[PDB]
Amino acid sequence: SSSQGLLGYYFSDLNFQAPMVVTSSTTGDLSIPSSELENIPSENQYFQSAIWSGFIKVKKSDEYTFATSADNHVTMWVDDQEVINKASNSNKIRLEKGRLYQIKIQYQRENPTEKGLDFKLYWTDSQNKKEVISSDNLQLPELKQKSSNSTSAGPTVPDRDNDGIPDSLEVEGYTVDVKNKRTFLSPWISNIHEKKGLTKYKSSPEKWSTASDPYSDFEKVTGRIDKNVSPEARHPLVAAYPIVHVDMENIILSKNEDRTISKNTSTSRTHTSEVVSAGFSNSNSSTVAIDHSLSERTWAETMGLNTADTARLNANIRYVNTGTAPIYNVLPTTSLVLGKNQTLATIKAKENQLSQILAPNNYYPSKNLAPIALNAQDDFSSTPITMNYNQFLELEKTKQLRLDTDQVYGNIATYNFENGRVRVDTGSNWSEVLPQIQETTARIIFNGKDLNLVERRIAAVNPSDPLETTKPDMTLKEALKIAFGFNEPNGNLQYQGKDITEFDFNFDQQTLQNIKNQLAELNATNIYEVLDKIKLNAKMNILIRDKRFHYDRNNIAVGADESVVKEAHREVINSSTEGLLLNIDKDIRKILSGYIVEIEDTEGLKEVINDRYDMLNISSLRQDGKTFIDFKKYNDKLPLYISNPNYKVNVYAVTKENTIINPSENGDTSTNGIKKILIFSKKGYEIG
Ligand SMILES: [Ca+2]
Ligand SMILES: [Ca+2]
């Protein structure tokens, strides 16, 4: 436990005013060699005062004499009783086993001749055995949030919220740097720390956790935190909390009786806009699209499902955490919903019986393991998921399901100062924390990574709330850098090489009005030029999306402009009568449902090879990540027959938003009404 010990505050001044280093020491050796002070101006490497705080506990009752390597400069209290005061002494104090004695030490030396501090806390037993106090006998002060209803003995570091960071540092700015076995927390000094690659922190001196999450500002920056918490959420202004949805991977529909439809499904976590404007809702939901492709006639007929029959549904799922904190003992409950509000099933996992962690940016079960079946194989008491005839017709019509997941996440792994360890705390519940996170942060949702919606929350002021006014200012620019890792190599804001102007900015109706007001005040008509001047407030909702795609009402990417789709297919690696091989970006493939292949004769007449709405699925991804478009799949497994070399092979792309998933009113099953985009056209002789 390299984080346990006494907590020390080292000041350059004589009167505990200018804290230069805040760090813990594991043993009674409270020294800081000048060698580990390279992030401190040499001039300020002289410590004229210091304060240490914590507890001492003993594992064998005895009478003890405390001594220090500089008693003449030390005043020391044990449970508010003064035991050393500017003179060495041999007074004994009885220390009882299994008790916690509060320790406080102050040190003052004017104008020391050495940089740093050489200082040790000793004790002597009843056997006259004197030694530097061991790591086993020391523990940190309890830097947890106090109660509403929460003397002296010496100097007090102003620390209104009891996180451990002095009020002045949180307000004016601080940083941390790891030297060997320790993390030194120091005031921000621009002329040293910028070119050392250090991060400048500010936080609220009134909020134990500035993001209102369950990890203290001090715990976050000193690494006294769950290792599974996302690295961006180690910043005191970025909230650390789980965000869980269910991903359905495939589905099997069957008729209930004493022939089946088995289809892959694609599932996306959603964010439902209002009317144009981002939504206010913080609920977890995902929408499932069932593959409409060919396996003949309707599913219902294939299953032999008639008016008085019932259909059964089974599926494989995983839980996905797209948040910034892990989950340990409770997976959230999920409703499987048909249409608007027809609940087909309640999906639950057993409380306190998780087989593994559900970590940020990860899955439950993990990808190397089998997914969860809604009705497991040997689980014969599991409730079947059934639907009547009408309900099944509705399912075949929409081929869509919804998964509404609650926000019940179980207990939190928190740091324990008693033993200097992170452990699951049974008295801490994510439900006791989420509402405050949601109430005190601005939310940004960004899809730049892979077009999936990723949500982050950033501590921001509430100008109506006195406590939330004590927070550091937060610009839109800074939030994007700290929460999402946007950067700016030459002062130009980017996300992973991509210019900021490539992304659209959308807000809820309240946030929009706020932003427009700020723009008018800045005499700006464009948000890009003033991203570093736009201020965020608590409860803003900001949606940021790649401009190259079309989005549905759930803000899922479902298409792109014709030119974007065409350009994406310009890179043909190989063409033959068997198919096309080409490089297609991941993001473009995400918005395509498949392709239509046609042969056009010299007269301009056409033969469509795969002429069914449910025959678009002729594209596959190779191991090397290239896309193969298979001409043979729906051509009776034969290469195209091109009767004359001057005939053309035309291949069209179909985007998700233009995909037809059922025959038309009149029973048309062809591709004739499908809105399609030409992406390849070559003559027989050009193909070879
Ligand atoms: Ca504080
Ligand atoms: Ca704080």
Residue numbers in the entry: 14 to 163, 169 to 276, 287 to 303, 320 to 339, 343 to 735
Reported in the publication:
Protective antigen (PA) is an element of the protein toxin secreted by B. anthracis. It is a key component of recombinant Anthrax vaccines, since the immune response against this virulence factor confers protection against B. anthracis infection. The structure of PA reveals four domains.
However, recombinantly PA (rPA) stored in aqueous solution is aggregation-prone. It was experimentally demonstrated that the solvent exposed APR (APR1) in domain 3 is the key determinant of rPA aggregation in vitro. An additional in silico mutation screen using FoldX revealed the stability of the T576E mutant could be improved by 1.2 kcal mol−1 by a compensatory mutation S559L. The mutant side chains were well defined in the electron density and superposed well with the predicted side-chain conformations by FoldX, further validating our approach. Far and near UV circular dichroism spectroscopy (CD) and near UV confirmed conservation of the structure between T576E/S559L and WT. Moveover, whereas WT shows characteristic signals of aggregation in the plot from 50 °C upwards, the T576E/S559L mutant starts aggregating only at a higher temperature, suggesting we have removed the APR responsible for aggregation during storage at room temperature. Plotting aggregation versus degree of unfolding, it appears the aggregation onset for WT occurs at 53% of the unfolding transition, whereas for the mutant aggregation only initiates at 84% of the unfolding transition. This is consistent with our design, in which we reduced the aggregation propensity of the strongest and most exposed APR by the T576E mutation, delaying aggregation until more advanced denaturation when the remaining APRs eventually become solvent exposed and initiate aggregation. Taken together, our data indicate that mutant T576E/S559L displays a lower aggregation propensity than the WT protein, while conservating both structure and biological activity of the PA protein.
